[model samples]
Structures are given as C-alpha cells and as structure tokens.
Target: GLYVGGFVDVVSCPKLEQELYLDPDQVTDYLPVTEPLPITIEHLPETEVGWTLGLFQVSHGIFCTGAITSPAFLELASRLADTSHVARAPVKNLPKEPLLEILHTWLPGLSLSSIHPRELSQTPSGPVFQHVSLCALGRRRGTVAVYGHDAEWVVSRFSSVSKSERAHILQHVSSCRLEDLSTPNFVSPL
Candidate 1:
C-alpha cells in the first residue's frame, strides 16, 4: 500500500460581447467593422507532488520491510496482481450501462474500450502490470498510480537475467502501460 496527495486549481472569466441593435447602414453611411471581443477563459494552477506511505506486514508473509514511495508505483503493484484474475469474458460480458458505471467509479471520464493492451502486461511467472497514463485520471489526487507486484520479488525474479535483457523487459513493460485514448469507446458518454 502507499499514500498520495495533490491539489487542483480552476480559474474562469466571463466573456464580453458587443452587438449593434440598429442596422449599420441606417445609422452610418459606411459599414462599421466589428471589434475583436474577449472570450471566457480558464486556467489550471500548477499542482505540487505530495507523498504517502503503506505499511508492510511481516506476519502476513509480505517481504517488504519499509514504506514504498509514490502512489503510482503502488497502483502498479496492485493492478499487476489483480489483472491476472480479470477474465476477458467477464469484462466483455458486463452490461454496457453497468460497465460504464464501474468505469466511471474507478476511472471517470474514460471508456472501457479505451483500456488499451499497452496499458496492461503479463509475466510468465509474475503478476500482471498495468500502466496508467495521465496520472490525474487516477483515483488518488496528484500521484499517478500503477499496479505492480512486490518490488523485491519482481527484482529477484529478474535477478538472473542479463542487464540488457532486464532493460528490454522493462522497456516493453513501460510501453504497454500507456493507455490508448484513440479508441471509439473512449469518446462514449457515461
């Protein structure tokens, strides 16, 4: 587990308008040119990265000895473990409305079909990995979250592989983590 924090800022200003009720030709011999008008605008203030922590249990058979950093990393750990149990049939069979509801609750403003293959991955012997792009989309504020297994276990499993092999594995894993927003489902309303 892990802790996370962040902030959000929004600024809005009304637009100005100027319209002539009378015909320009009637009021003046020459036509008048319209002046540039200002419109409403919004701004999002810069947000700061906050910190959180999750405790590990020794009696429960967990291997980690201390708190982990970043909620995104912890999210990755959780998703990695859970994705292994996600049957495609169940995901696909869910009713459209309910499925949309679930997605809204878990990942608001995102469509189920938008869940790209690159957003998830599976190791021959380890948990599945799910990459989360747009950290702001995560349930947690500020921190971008991902789901992964225990870091020590993951490292130990790959310990035997050469550095290049490890790099290649990590690279592929990262590529798969980014979500694809171009799918049709992504544009559907909840």
Candidate 2:
C-alpha cells in the first residue's frame, strides 16, 4: 500500500492555464539578446512543412543546430549566440545546473523529468542531452527539444501537436552536422 502511495506522489500537479499563454516578445525582453549568426536555417521536407532547422559550427568545436515550426521561435536559433550562461561554456556532464537554466529561461514550467539523456553512438565524443518540452509556452505552439553533445548543441521547436505527432529531430541534426562539418565557424564579422 505504501509503495503504491509513493508511486502516486509522482503525479503531476495542476497549473494556471493563463500563465502558459505568454507573449513571446515580452519573454524575449527579460532575456539578453544578441546579434544573430549568419547561419543557414531550412525546413525539412520529410517532416511537416514550416518545421525549420538551423545548423552552425562555433569556434573551438562548438556546433549548434536548431529547428522551429513556429514563426515566433524563428529567431531563437539565430540569437542563441548570446545565451552565454548556458550555451557558451563547456558541458562536462548531463543533468547539470546549466541544463536547468536552459529550460528555465527558454521553456519554463517544463520539469527535469522531461529531459532524456542518451548515448547515441559509441563514437567516443560526449553524451547527448535532449530536453523535450511539449507544454513550454502555454502548451499551444511551444513544443521544443534541445540536443547537445559536449559544447555542441541543437534546438528544435514545433507547433503544438498531440503526443503521437512529436518527432525527434535528433538524428536529422546529427547527420546534418556531419554533412556540414567542413563549414567555417560563425566568427563575429568585423
């Protein structure tokens, strides 16, 4: 009986539905903003249209890939250069503090339980950090998933969809980065 009660303790709590429908612009104002990198952002044909993805390499082996299906989230991938608090530093391990910072700032109301830590390959690089959120921004059009490998990170956002519609863009970006591995990093243009 106690074991069942303990399991029930993990049940999710209720939330104020009003808090979820926040204005995207207002959300950006609270966070630091910076110049967007001149990286390539594209839509995946295999997936639903408007599901865009951007991939870029940073200096000293910092790679970034981001995808979004919402117009409001279009600039997130570009402005990621300034989120130094999380993306700029090196990530030594999973379920770290900065991981919390990322979801807190970018996608609040999402819990650590939403994160999935996986080792995709035995290639000996780093563990992959995938933070998936279906109710990030009011549970409407704010679904997002961030993928990471050491310093390299990938972000993907999508319009609100049912659980069955959610697709993992992890492999898409994984292979995309491999294809664009030879490209130059996004150094500040003088």
Candidate 3:
C-alpha cells in the first residue's frame, strides 16, 4: 500500500529518532525493495494555499515571491532557501512603511537604502510593477544598491528628469504588454 521506506522499524536499532541507525550491509529478512510510488506533485488549489512577497537586500534589492499554487514561485523559494542570506517573517497586511519597518527591526543589519519602494501587483499573467516609472526606479535602485551607492545616489540620478518626461515614460510603459518585456521569466497558472 506504500512506497519504499514508508514504514520504518523502531526497536531494531539503537540510535536517535532523527538519525539513521540501520546498518546498510546488515542482513535482514523484512527489507522490501518496492518501486517508488508514481505520485504527481501538481498544483491543486483545493489542497494548496497562501501567498507571500519577500524582499532581500543583497548589496542590491532582490524581490523573492511565492504562492502555494505557483510552481515557479515554489521552485524559486527552494533555491533561495539554500543560500546563506535567507530570512523569513510573517506580516499582517501590506502597509508599505510599517511592513518594511518591522523587517528592518527584525534584521538590524540591513538598511532602507531605497526610498522609492518597489510596488508589485499580481495579475492573471504574472506580477508587474504598477507603473513604468516604478519599474524604471526599481531597476535603477537595484543597480545602485548593489554596486556602491545608497538611496541618495539613486534619488540624484532621476532628480534631473522633468515631470512631463516622467509622465510620458509611465504612459509608454503601461502600454507595453508583460510578454513583450521578456520571455521565459513570467509564471502563469497555465
């Protein structure tokens, strides 16, 4: 009824509950070599739940995201968890400043080097920046944050741009489709 190593014997060996106590070369009569179950691990909304948006300051800003049903996000989480810079927390709601503040308090080693917070909205296609300007700012801030500067440097770079030009950039970015931005990156339910 089960796959390999599903029901383990307890009294046969002497070791910690979490550690391996079985001698691999020991001759045994009850060891079974059964084929592993062909269980599929696809996204079933009924059994899966929750969503999370994470931020990590890795010299720059890295936005790590996850959803119970998003395979891509799950894979990304697994990858990031293997790294040394992993940090995790739970938040009540999406209050921009407060959320960041709590995270900062929790991890005092990090700083808010980017005054312009990156905003993302989830869509049927994928997550996207609310406006083009925001996207541009996020990209620029990431560059500066990772390289050698802080929020001051990022702010000065865009300070010279006029309001009219900034508006135009926003309009232009809004018109462009997510697919057009890049291929093979965006994750969809399909």
Candidate 4:
C-alpha cells in the first residue's frame, strides 16, 4: 500500500514549473548594486556578463562558490576585529551572558537568503545553486526518508519518549538521491 500510495501521490501532485531562467542573458553582468546580493537572491546577476562562479562537490554535497564583495559585510568583519573587540576575548571564549547577548543581537542581523542566480549557474546544472545558497546562508543541510512502520527500530535516549517526534524529524531529511536522523541532546533546557 505504501509504495502504491507513492505512485498515486506522484500522479496527483501538481506539475512543477521551471523555477528560474538562469541563462547568461538573464543575469546582470557587473553586479546590480554595490551591496552584496541578498543570499536569498539567485542568478539575477551583477551584470550582463554575469558573475563567474564555480561549482564543486565533496562528501556533504555540491555547492556553488562565489565571493561577496559587499562593503557592508566587510565593515562587519572589520568591526569584529577593530576597536572595542581589539582587546576583547575570542568569540568562542567570551562569557556566557555576553556571548548570548552578542548572539541574540548579531544573529538577528545575519540574514540568509539566495545569492545571484548567474553566479549560481556556474555549476554543472543550474539547479545545484540551492545547496550553495543553503550553505552560504547557514541553513541546515540533510535528508530524510519515510517508509511504513516497518521502518527500522531505533534505540535512542528519547526512543520511547519521542517516537512520533523522532519519526517526524526523521522524515524531514538529502542532496540528490541522498539525509537527517539525529541523536540530538540538550545542552540546556531548550
């Protein structure tokens, strides 16, 4: 019934449209603006020639690699090293509250989104840019597969406590034909 359901589901699903037009003609060559393109932004481009990009693959998966030339981002890095932080402790070595404060404050400002699509297409297939975007913006990357209750039994600390929760999370994962089942632990109550 499960695999049969997969067939039904596939037939019933709405047709997916071509997501983007990443051809060279579609992208801006010189970069549209002085600011770094939004991480959520894709193949839109820096100019007509578009930005050159590289796509590479390793254990984690394939990725589109490009440089962000935004002065604002550079300014942030300068701030992290200059003035008030010059004598300050390393980001990892900071005390708890201060670290939390910084994280709370700065993390909000750190937005992750698409990058220019032109640069994104520098990969083998244009679609590969999504993985690059996810990594660039710090999004979680993994894959999950769900089958029938015949799913393998899992022995975990929360095995009994969170079967449904675990199952749900397990079903949330991959790159290509590829995945997350986590052995998560709480460092704090959260």
Candidate 5:
C-alpha cells in the first residue's frame, strides 16, 4: 500500500480524502491513543469506493489521514456511524489548506506537506529507503541510534567537518563492526 496520505471514515460517517504526502516523515508525530478520530464531520453514503478519511492523534495533535481500501474505509465508517455525530447532507470539502485553519472550522495537522515536486529533472537513486528516511528523521544529530537497514553496510557522514578531516572520517570511521561499510556509491546528502 502507498500509505502516502489520505483520510478514512470510521463508524458510519464519511471523512475527507486525499493522502497527498508520499513520505512517512511528512506525517505528524502522533501520540499513542490506540483510538483515532475523524478529521472532518462531513460524511456521505459510499455507494461506491475510491478512498476515505480518518484522524489519528499524535504527541503534536490529531491529524487527518486517507485510506485507499473500502474494507479499511468501512472500518472507519463503523467508528464514524458509531459516533453520535450525524451530518444531514454533503458538507463542504475540507479547505485546500485545511491544517492552517481552526476555530470556526476544523483541520488536521497530519496533512503531509508535499516533500517533493511532482516532476524531477536530474536525480539519481541514492541509498536504500532507510537511508534517506532515517537521515531526514535524524535531523542533524552527530550519531544514529539505529544502524544499517541490511544489518551489514552503512552510508553516513560527519554532521559538520573539514574536507581533510572528513577524509579522515571516511578513512578512519567509527561503527559497531570492525569491517567498513559494504554499500557502494553510498554518499551522504549532508
């Protein structure tokens, strides 16, 4: 599944849709509620299927998300229809910039801020998925708590340093293992 972004309906209510953010980092840091919420009150009978909306709470707050499957959508629908809230008809769509607005309105912080442009000009494949996502998630920390995704090779660099010293870092690097990283063409974005 893409798990990119979107919304779902729980209970019987229909939530918003469109999970635009493609990267996992885009999602807000949700707290552990075990119980998620609906991003929008707008609900509609789903005679057919495409995608749906739901809300999840994180440490930051509750943000909206979209699911692509009907079965998944139905799960949300039950939670929705199960709720006391019942909208009469099709309500207004969530604002295009939903998260920015609040009082007098509602929005979710989970909206994934599109991380990349739809079109790319010149970009080559980099390290494995974990490399990039982890780096992005790592912020600018000096060391990483987790190691290589493969449990073998790794690609990393100094958070800040000179070229000569940087060379020394590469030549004499630190790691949990004695051998150096096995991955090739693996360079650090920073």
Candidate 6:
C-alpha cells in the first residue's frame, strides 16, 4: 500500500533577499515566515511498510509509501519510478544532490526552488528504512495515506482538527478521510 501527501500554500512567504545593503549584518533571520513548513506524517500507529520521496529526501520501509498524487498521480509515479531507478542505482551510489537533479529533469514544470537537503538516519532494519526531515516551500495539494497503519488513529487525529484548521487543510488538500477514497480515479490513496 501507499501513502499520498500533498498541500498548497495560499500565501507563500518571500525568500531571503541578497540585496547589497550598506550593513550586511542588518539581515535578520526570518523565522516563521509566511511560507509553509514541511508537513510530517507522524504518530502513525500501524505503518508497517512505505517509502517517502521528494526533492531532497528519499526513504523506504517495508510497510509504507508516500507520494504526491494530485493533479497528476500517474505522471508523478512515472517520473518517480524512472528517476528512482537511474538516480538511486547502487552502481552510481549517488547522493541527494544528484537525485534532486534527476527529479528536476523529471518534473520540469513544478517549481523546486524551495527544496533543501536534510540529514538521514538508518533504522535497525539494516538500511531498509531511513528517517528524514526536509524543508519544503511551494504548495501542491495535502494528504497522508496509511497502508497497514492504523486507519482509526489517522482519522482520529485528523478529525480532531479544529474547524478553521480543517478548512485550511481542505483548501489545499482534496480529501482527508478514509471514506473519501471511493472515487474510481482519485489522486491520493486516502
């Protein structure tokens, strides 16, 4: 099974400008900028196998998979498969930079300007899984799909979301519940 996640930023924050100001020290660190933060799929109780991939991070597990599947799930999958095969090949043993390059080539239309590198940690499973957290900017669509994971827990947490927060989530995400997966050709798994 697969887990799909997506989100859209209604009002993106500005980037750190490199203007030639008289005092270079005057540049302030922009924290909590209006930009969207990387959404984390955590507290999942039953995710036994999966993989997650974006611009700068790639992780795999036997019980879970995450992918961006809105607007064009098939296209995204195609690009992912092609790039994963070439860039993640054991022969090249490429790092994250080269993998991102391959992603850029695959999804030329999407703006990957905000993708950033992150540290990875190997689980006890002998490299079969990796934990990664990266900073992402841009908005797409927001969802998290659970496979052998606890659907009830997923629903409970998401359902507990406040109305305003839920609305905000719905604004960017197409669906957030298990029942919403009834469509024949939905972008996300649910």
Which candidate has the highest lDDT of all? 6
Per-model TM against the reference = 0.17, 0.22, 0.21, 0.25, 0.18, 0.21
lDDT tens digits, residue span 1-190, model 5: 1111212111110122442323332322321122222221222222221221223432222322222223443344334433324321222454332211221122111222222323222442431111011112212212222222221122222232334433332332222232221212222222
Better of 1 and 3 by lDDT: 3
Over the stretch 17-135, how does candidate 1's per-residue lDDT look in tens digits? 32112211121221111211111001111211111111111111111111123334334434433453342234344444332222223322100011122222331232111111112
Q: TM-score of predicted model 4?
A: 0.25
Tens digit per residue, CA lDDT, model 3, 25-134: 22122122121111111212222222211222111122211112234534543343343243333323343434232323332221111111111112124222110000
- Decoy 6 TM-score against native: 0.21
Clashes of each: 14, 0, 0, 30, 31, 17
What is each predicted model's overall lDDT from 0 to 1?
Answer: 0.22, 0.25, 0.23, 0.24, 0.24, 0.27
Error of 1 at 52 (Å): 29
Off by over 4 Å in 4: 1-52, 84-90, 94-138, 142-190
- Runs in model 2 lying further than 4 Å from the true structure: 1-100, 103-140, 145-147, 150-171, 176-185, 188-190
| Per-residue error (Å), model 2, residue 56 | 19
User: Which wins on TM-score, candidate 2 or candidate 4?
Assistant: 4
Model 5: lDDT to the true structure = 0.24
Model 3, runs deviating above 4 Å: 1-157, 179-182, 185-190
- Sorted by lDDT (best first), the order is 6, 2, 4, 5, 3, 1
lDDT of 1 at 84: 30
Better of 2 and 5 by lDDT: 2
Candidate 6 global lDDT: 0.27
Error of 6 at 40 (Å): 14
Q: What's the residue-level lDDT of 102 in candidate 1?
A: 28
